[PDB]
């Protein structure tokens, strides 16, 4: 059945989308908002009043006090907006390259493993966004490794903190320890922690 | 306790959101080891260079920085329709998100247009200035040897040659037979 | 005076100035001339305006700016002082302003000179530095007087 | 006595092509020249392939010059914000290692 309207001009739309992406900072947010709304309308997730952060007794336990204070340090209060955003940005296009909200973790006490899980969960719930900020994650995990697995860490870092892929597809590690910057995300380099080369 | 709510519900929300009109980029291939974004620029011989993805650091929008701590509420303090005991699942009308995708696309074409339009003019369009020196007496101004400046060629001609998959036209030195020029012109 | 050209009613002067300006060796101009955009932000940073000004002042202004830009010391380097005046292993973050917020490098040599000099002239300088350190101890809250 | 004199008798004479003793400004007052890569000012080259003479090399006064100057985007001396973050436990801090 005819619809007396002009055809969706696929090609022109992608071009103008690209120009807008080049010139209009607000584009990113616009698209996100659309996606956020969808999540908000799908009613897939709402915050609840009570927090199920600790197993019963462990919150009030006197020797748990550090781990509790660790978990409480990471465990932020829920907001529908921040959650829906977190969900939406897995699908939304990224334009300004993303950055991790940097964490200062020495990883002395065992409880510091929270931060490690905080990343692992992030990689599960949000593989995409994780993939954007992963080098910035690697800067933190390297402290965790050097402190927890010093010898494996010296071996790994001797191989190189990063690598590039050559045209044949083989990995090529730097041989050098260098701190990651997101400036590199757009370059040929990849964090070496995520190479999965044994 | 919540994993069903993630895999058996929210996953569909990702699957449909992935088909939305405005999620045009390929965000991630499922392999951390090898994935890199496809990277594009608007760019001209005239000298403009405008990356689509670029790293400027934290922006006013608040989209750039990511607090990963958001995972904790998602586990330890958020209810879901699936959990729990039975609750009706919402399937949003396409029309809302769709129609606002469309309204955004029209806002965008309307917005980029004056920029695109002015530049079409500053470009000077699909034409090039060209001197035509005469080589014989009784030559009309139309007749003679056509020639143009390199800047015009870069600006208007060369990109089209690149876009048509043909060899770059030969340079002409002192040692240049007409037959070579013919091979080049036909090339 | 190069602006008087074809505007002054005095004929000989306009002729003379036209001759000087039509020489190969001399060419008046009223910049902007040299733009310099950042490598990352791609916006203009230092620009070269050909002002009507004496060459001495221009040379001093340029000396100062050249100092500030050639240092390659951004505001981010202030963090290195902050670490020094902070409890060991404080971390500092952000915002990576970059080349867009340049500053002069901390002049180590000149400061140590002025310090040794003042310490020669002003022994009481001791009591100033002590006072600073005293305050830090006082704020670190390591030890408090008590009635017991 | 008139060592500072740039110009003189900016008037027309009704008979002669220029009044006697009239003084045109020196060409150097008007050679804006170029800022050099060093930051040194220079007059324009006198002939092709020559670098220009630095304006400070010589005693003429040049009243047009290229002063470099920062635009609004560059800013310096503004106070700068940061997230300072304290050590989690004072006992864990490492005073020592090289």
């Amino acid at each position: 059945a005819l619809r007396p309207e002009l055809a969706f001009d696929h090609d022109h739309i992608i071009r103008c989308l690209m120009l807008a992406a080049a010139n209009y900072p607000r584009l990113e947010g616009i698209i996100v908002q659309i996606n956020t709304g969808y999540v908000a309308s799908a009613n897939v997730i709402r915050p609840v009043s009570e927090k199920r952060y600790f197993p019963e007794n462990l919150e009030q336990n006197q020797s748990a006090a550090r781990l509790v204070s660790a978990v409480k340090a990471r465990a932020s209060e829920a907001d529908i907006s921040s959650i829906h955003l977190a969900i939406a940005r897995e699908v939304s296009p990224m334009f300004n390259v993303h950055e991790l909200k940097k964490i200062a973790e020495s990883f002395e006490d065992p409880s510091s493993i929270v931060v490690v899980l905080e990343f692992i969960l992030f990689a599960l719930f949000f593989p995409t966004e994780f993939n954007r900020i992963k080098g910035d994650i690697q800067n933190v995990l390297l402290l965790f490794f050097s402190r927890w697995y010093p010898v494996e860490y010296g071996i790994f870092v001797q191989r190189g903190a990063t690598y590039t892929i050559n045209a044949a597809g083989e990995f090529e590690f730097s041989g050098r320890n260098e701190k990651w910057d997101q400036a590199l995300y757009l370059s040929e380099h990849f964090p070496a922690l995520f190479s999965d080369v044994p | 306790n919540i994993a069903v709510a993630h895999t058996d519900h929210l996953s569909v929300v990702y699957a449909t959101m992935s088909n939305f009109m405005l999620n045009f980029t390929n965000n991630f291939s499922g392999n951390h080891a090898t994935f890199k974004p496809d990277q594009y620029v608007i760019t001209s011989p005239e000298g403009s260079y405008k990356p689509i993805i670029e790293r400027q650091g934290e922006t006013v929008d608040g989209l750039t920085i990511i607090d990963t701590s958001i995972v904790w509420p998602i586990l330890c303090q958020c209810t879901y329709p699936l959990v729990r005991i039975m609750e009706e699942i919402v399937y949003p009308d396409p029309s809302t998100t769709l129609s606002q995708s469309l309204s955004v696309a029209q806002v965008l074409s309307k917005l980029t247009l004056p920029d695109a339009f002015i530049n079409m003019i500053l470009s000077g369009g699909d034409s090039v200035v060209m001197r035509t020196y005469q080589t014989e007496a009784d030559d009309d101004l139309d007749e003679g040897i056509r020639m143009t400046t390199y800047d015009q060629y870069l600006s208007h001609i060369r990109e089209r040659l690149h876009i048509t998959n043909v060899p770059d036209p030969i340079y002409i030195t002192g040692a240049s037979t007409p037959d070579q020029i013919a091979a080049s012109v036909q090339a | 005076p190069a602006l008087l050209r074809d505007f002054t009613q005095v004929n000989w002067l306009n002729r003379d100035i036209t001759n000087m300006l039509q020489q190969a060796g001399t060419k008046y101009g009223l910049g902007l001339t040299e733009t310099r955009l950042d490598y990352v932000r791609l916006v203009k940073t230092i620009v070269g305006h050909a002002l009507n000004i004496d060459h001495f002042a221009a040379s001093v202004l340029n000396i100062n700016l050249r100092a500030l830009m050639e240092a390659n010391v951004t505001a981010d380097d202030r963090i290195k002082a902050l670490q020094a005046h902070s409890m060991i292993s404080t971390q500092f973050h952000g915002p990576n302003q970059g080349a867009l917020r340049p500053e002069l490098a901390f002049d180590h040599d000149h400061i140590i000179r002025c310090l040794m000099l003042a310490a020669a002239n002003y022994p009481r300088l001791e009591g100033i530095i002590v006072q600073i350190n005293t305050g830090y101890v006082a704020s670190a809250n390591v030890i408090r007087p008590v009635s017991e | 006595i008139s060592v500072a004199r740039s110009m003189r008798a900016i008037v027309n004479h009704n008979e002669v092509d220029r009044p006697r003793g009239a003084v045109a400004p020196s060409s150097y007052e008007m050679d804006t020249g170029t800022l050099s890569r060093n930051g040194d000012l220079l007059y324009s080259p006198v002939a092709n392939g020559q670098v220009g003479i630095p304006k400070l090399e010589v005693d003429h006064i040049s009243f047009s010059n290229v002063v470099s100057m920062m635009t609004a985007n560059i800013r310096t001396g503004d106070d700068m914000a940061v997230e300072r973050v304290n050590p989690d436990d004072v006992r864990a801090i490492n005073i020592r290692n090289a």
Partner: peptide, 15 residues
Amino acid sequence: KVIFNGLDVNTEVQP
């Protein structure tokens, strides 16, 4: 504590 997608600045260094 509360979620915040941005640097959580507190210090203001002087030049």
